[PDB]
Design a protein around this ligand. Sequence first.
Ligand SMILES: OC[C@@H](O)[C@@H](O)/C(O)=N/O
Ligand SMILES: OC[C@@H](O)[C@@H](O)/C(O)=N/O
Ligand SMILES: OC[C@@H](O)[C@H](O)/C(O)=N/O
Ligand SMILES: OC[C@@H](O)[C@H](O)/C(O)=N/O
Ligand SMILES: [Mg+2]
Ligand SMILES: [Mg+2]
Ligand SMILES: [Mg+2]
Ligand SMILES: [Mg+2]
Ligand SMILES: [Mg+2]
Ligand SMILES: [Mg+2]
Ligand SMILES: [Mg+2]
Ligand SMILES: [Mg+2]
Lengths: 385, 385, 385, 385
Amino acid sequence: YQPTPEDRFTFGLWTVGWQGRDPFGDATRPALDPVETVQRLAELGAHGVTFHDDDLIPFGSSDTERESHIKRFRQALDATGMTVPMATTNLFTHPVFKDGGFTANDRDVRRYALRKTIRNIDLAVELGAKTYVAWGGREGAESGAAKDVRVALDRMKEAFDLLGEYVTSQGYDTRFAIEPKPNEPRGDILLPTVGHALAFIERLERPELYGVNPEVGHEQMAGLNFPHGIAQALWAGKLFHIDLNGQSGIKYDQDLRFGAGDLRAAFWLVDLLESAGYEGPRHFDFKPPRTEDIDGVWASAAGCMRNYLILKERAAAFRADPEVQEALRASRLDELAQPTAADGVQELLADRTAFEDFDVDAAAARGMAFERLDQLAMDHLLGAR
Amino acid sequence: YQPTPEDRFTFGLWTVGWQGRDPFGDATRPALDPVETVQRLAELGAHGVTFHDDDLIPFGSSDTERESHIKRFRQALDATGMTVPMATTNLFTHPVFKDGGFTANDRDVRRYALRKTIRNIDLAVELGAKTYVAWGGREGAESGAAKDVRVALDRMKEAFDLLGEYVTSQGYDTRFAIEPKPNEPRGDILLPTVGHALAFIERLERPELYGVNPEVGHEQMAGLNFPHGIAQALWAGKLFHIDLNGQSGIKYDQDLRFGAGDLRAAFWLVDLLESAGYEGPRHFDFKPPRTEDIDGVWASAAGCMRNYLILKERAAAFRADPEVQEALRASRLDELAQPTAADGVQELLADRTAFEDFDVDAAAARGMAFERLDQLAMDHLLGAR
Amino acid sequence: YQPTPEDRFTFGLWTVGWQGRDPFGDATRPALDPVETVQRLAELGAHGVTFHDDDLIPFGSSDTERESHIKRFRQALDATGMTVPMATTNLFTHPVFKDGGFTANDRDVRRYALRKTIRNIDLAVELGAKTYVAWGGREGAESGAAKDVRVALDRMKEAFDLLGEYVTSQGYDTRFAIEPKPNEPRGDILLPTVGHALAFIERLERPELYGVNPEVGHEQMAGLNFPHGIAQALWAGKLFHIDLNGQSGIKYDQDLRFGAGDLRAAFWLVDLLESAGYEGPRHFDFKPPRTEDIDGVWASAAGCMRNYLILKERAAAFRADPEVQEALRASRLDELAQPTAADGVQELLADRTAFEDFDVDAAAARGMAFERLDQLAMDHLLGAR
Amino acid sequence: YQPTPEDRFTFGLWTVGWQGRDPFGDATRPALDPVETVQRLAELGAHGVTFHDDDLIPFGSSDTERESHIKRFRQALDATGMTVPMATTNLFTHPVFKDGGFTANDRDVRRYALRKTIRNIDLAVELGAKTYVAWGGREGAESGAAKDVRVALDRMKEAFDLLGEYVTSQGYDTRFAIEPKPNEPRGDILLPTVGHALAFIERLERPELYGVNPEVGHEQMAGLNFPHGIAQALWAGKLFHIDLNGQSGIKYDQDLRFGAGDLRAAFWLVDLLESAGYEGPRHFDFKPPRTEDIDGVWASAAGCMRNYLILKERAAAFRADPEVQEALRASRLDELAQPTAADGVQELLADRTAFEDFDVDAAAARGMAFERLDQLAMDHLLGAR
Ligand SMILES: OC[C@@H](O)[C@@H](O)/C(O)=N/O
Ligand SMILES: OC[C@@H](O)[C@@H](O)/C(O)=N/O
Ligand SMILES: OC[C@@H](O)[C@H](O)/C(O)=N/O
Ligand SMILES: OC[C@@H](O)[C@H](O)/C(O)=N/O
Ligand SMILES: [Mg+2]
Ligand SMILES: [Mg+2]
Ligand SMILES: [Mg+2]
Ligand SMILES: [Mg+2]
Ligand SMILES: [Mg+2]
Ligand SMILES: [Mg+2]
Ligand SMILES: [Mg+2]
Ligand SMILES: [Mg+2]
């Protein structure tokens, strides 16, 4: 279960780099230099790194000091072979984005938001990123009249159509992935789930430029089944990126290392990613618990990739097992793939077997055998098979 | 706060008609005849009624006894002036729909599902319904391998495209509203929120025939802000119907009378429905708590409409108040309506005031005054103003 | 991983005998004869069965029909060597209970409830039950003024006090175990968590005759840590019995088979009970899904036992592992067991190294080494180690 | 609805003094001088302020700087007639606490925590505090093996026992009030609910020196009924103090102003405390949103007091209403107060009307009349009545 760069595992600079501050405490670890992070990650067997502009270049740096940062970073990438698949904007930390970035009530703060973003898009594309994520963590409200949602969305649609026009005019090959989240730090964040984000993308001027970047713990802060949501992102053809971590319940977002939190949901997400051939980076946006020192950080981080590869093995052994292939026919998972009525309406209506002569009760009593199948999955996760 | 038929309040036959059975208990009230329900509701001041085929016509009734039911019902409507704005199918109760209706693994049960639905669509349109709701309460799973979600959705899309073709061929003016729900009775239901349902409708053959039918308690079983979701259904132009009730938390769906459960969320939903000019029925899909006898039922039911009209008054007094109109300018809710960059990209990029010369910190310190505004809403809800 | 009576695995008649009617669903299974259930669970390796009074004797039986159901049950237990370690009363199915048993507002319903419980305490004793469970499913409320809850804690205590007087006047060697649950079938239930039941006991006249019977799913309904809840109850000496099952987070109570739901909490639970030296029943309170026929009912009751036995084996190996031992030392679980200040408050107060010359910066710099310890735990659970 | 000291409304220095840094956000406000806060809260009508040791005296101060901060604070309290009813210790901000204070695995951190608490018990006593709050925010865990929780309940009890010995050896007229919280800043926190804190107290050497300090938001984090939780604590005689605020369901702790969040639970809370005759502080533990400047900080601290006073007035009128009295009788809240069986177990057992000749069908047919009683309650709250 040794990670190699062929596995496409990537991490955020801010993940291993998180210093330990939370609503009730101060930093527990030092600030990590992005060069030591690149180097360490490459020795852990990771494939790449990602970044918010303010992880790389500390807010309000001039162009000198901006260059000095990018250059020492670009040397650490060249030397390691590490790649930067995705980058993003910090439109949440500075006191100025307290009521948002793209949907801030103040018109000045909103146009700025966008200048800060376009500036970083040019660094991302230079460094090789093919996805540009946008997590609108400040777009929402703690009270009902503070934000009119129909207009704030007109604004959000305008801010994305503005970005879609600029990439189109510059000829970049970059695509945007919108990252939904139900709450935290705002009381309610706009586009709270993968569903909302999928529907919102269909109202942007050029929908094809836009997908989602789901995050495990996010959808589970809404008590939702993450593999189910990802299957709908896949069905739409909109899983551009995926953020992986752990969450132990409906509570504040924990950002545990992946495989921690809900373990059976972690197994079905690996199973689905792998059975549907997801190509993108397996990115860990997670937070080494502030109880740890730096050794615990790279450890927590190695554990993210270990559990991915272990669950990957158990999901392939499950799908491969003849007895489970048989168990799927027993539960009629082959009949689900069958068209309900390729032939059509006229045919269905006419069919007496489908209503008039249909023995409902015989059919009611055909057991689904779902439990035999789920214990086979349980033994395969546990390696009792 | 006297309900009149001009207020468009409507109820389900199964709401006041619910006998009191739950996962741990038996019926506490008798079965209510749909004629006594029509009559009683009209005397309460309601505008109309709705129905699942099996509320009206008891499952497997022949055509004689089917006619006998519809006719005595149609006489109670004629005599009262009561209207039937919406109807639907019970694709959840009978033991045969234990693994779904439209996405049942068994192909036979699926085509049947549809015959049962098309049959009822013809009764609905005859009776004057303009919306046909579909609540797929059995479409989901309690375990990961029991349902492949990408295929079950291909099936769900096919089942809806099949219905969209039949209305198109018969020339009916009926539209479909899809009702999302996170869970219960299935462990995870497909299309768990308004967001998911909006995005799914964009992949049906004729999207224009389809909207949502949100339900208050549903989105709050996902810990989500219901007014926020409804604003996105409105923005899309997809709020075809709305189901109103109460929910006191993330737990089993309670179906409390409306205004019960989350009261501040009830005030912002009325405020939004009214400020955006929703035309549809104000439908109460709720359940008189089984502690009640029949007097408690019509009482609980009258309380649904009372709280709608009381909250309606407080929302109009809030929007009307000069001091609150002033409070909205103070929080810059007028600037949210303003285009971010009608002029465009070139202009924004060039603008030094929007990035290069922008004083972030002055702007950071412009307080939002959100709290003064939310206490003004609080005094208006409470009638301290 | 095949069970035998040595494992003390038990199952209520109500669990495999669930007919599958839920809020929106008719029963999908035929009732099971009790005598068939003790046979089939004996053949799968069970220790014995438990029951509610109205599980074994139909409500209303008459008092020769009762005689008969008891003789048949007795003979089947004697035939298989199946025990009856626990029994309980049903104070939630019949409508006389719609407002509660011990705390209904109607006095005469609290008298019919108290007398009904004493009838089954006598029978339970004759059959060999040494624990009597009390789950007040209907005690609680939907609205605020409906229940004065300080006077309801008065009526709860009165009942449990008279029940204690009753069994001590009889010389009955039996103890009570109160089962908490936060909600369902009531909006909120009285004594909603483990901590709430434990606190109530201390105010009873004979605190020693009472303990707690916690369920996995009930504490998970409130997002609590079920292993921690079990540890506080063993710390208090009050874990008299337990109900094992699974639950996928905060929603309706599903009662999935033990092992399903939060699989790592089931790992951590079995590590606790086996380490604890808990020697009461491993009782399963689960429902086979209504998707399942009677074969699938037996694949799910066997799944319960199998999951617990894999889990015991994985937890046993985790704790025996040299690696894990060194990591526990590294995370100072041994320092946690040394007293903070056995040297009294006076030498603590004069210990200048406890404050004045405590170095908080060398103490704050130390990593806890919990991510590495938890990854060794994940490795054992997945059979990677 | 203007407050005055007669209303005993208090506020920690940490509440209006929150600078607004959250998980993803830098502080949006300047720190407040303590002396400015007692002045501004005195001018709004407060009773007094509370503090954590490191709120009044900066961590690391030196032991003349400490002298000075105490003298300045004293003089400002004496200037305004502001009291200091409660004080607490900060065992959660500094990294030495990252694994806990009283239950860190490191022994020497449990010694620095115990000594730090005793330093502030002395100071609190001199200033007039008759309640000492203990919120173990960092006591608990993120992973299972990290904390043996039965040995952590040993270390918790040891600390609270030595603290009891300390204050009785001193003759200090002060009592402790343990504050539960389910999670944040730890994945799960020890003593997570009211019931869990109440149960722990009974095992201490001097149960009488300890009570509970529950917060609205903390019980709501677990979806519990906060009015019911407060009623069990007054039933046990243990409500020593309270923290009032608001929370919109299950998610991170927001600490909204009292009145916001679950407005009807705030109604039902104030009905309980005013009916209860609770005469301790009405303490607000809230955060003005980080959206707000310092004027908006004061519009939110004034909102707290105003909401409680409207609510007291609406609840007072609900209970005084003839209509409500008759409805309470109709829902037999008076029968709930008559003993079930004051006539002992023996005449209960021979009362043939308690069982043999109890008619369960005429008892089951009776409505509880709770929807009508709850709608009269909704009418009072909205000022419709
Ligand atoms: O009545 C016994 C109780 O254990 C059980 O059936 C349950 O857990 N209800 O939720
Ligand atoms: O430490 C005192 C405690 O009351 C407070 O600040 C809190 O409620 N934390 O959640
Ligand atoms: O700002 C980038 C974003 O992905 C971030 O890591 C997040 O989702 N925190 O909740
Ligand atoms: O089947 C119609 C549907 O609207 C139903 O009332 C529901 O949503 N129960 O959860
Ligand atoms: Mg995140
Ligand atoms: Mg993310
Ligand atoms: Mg519903
Ligand atoms: Mg509905
Ligand atoms: Mg149970
Ligand atoms: Mg249960
Ligand atoms: Mg507090
Ligand atoms: Mg708090």
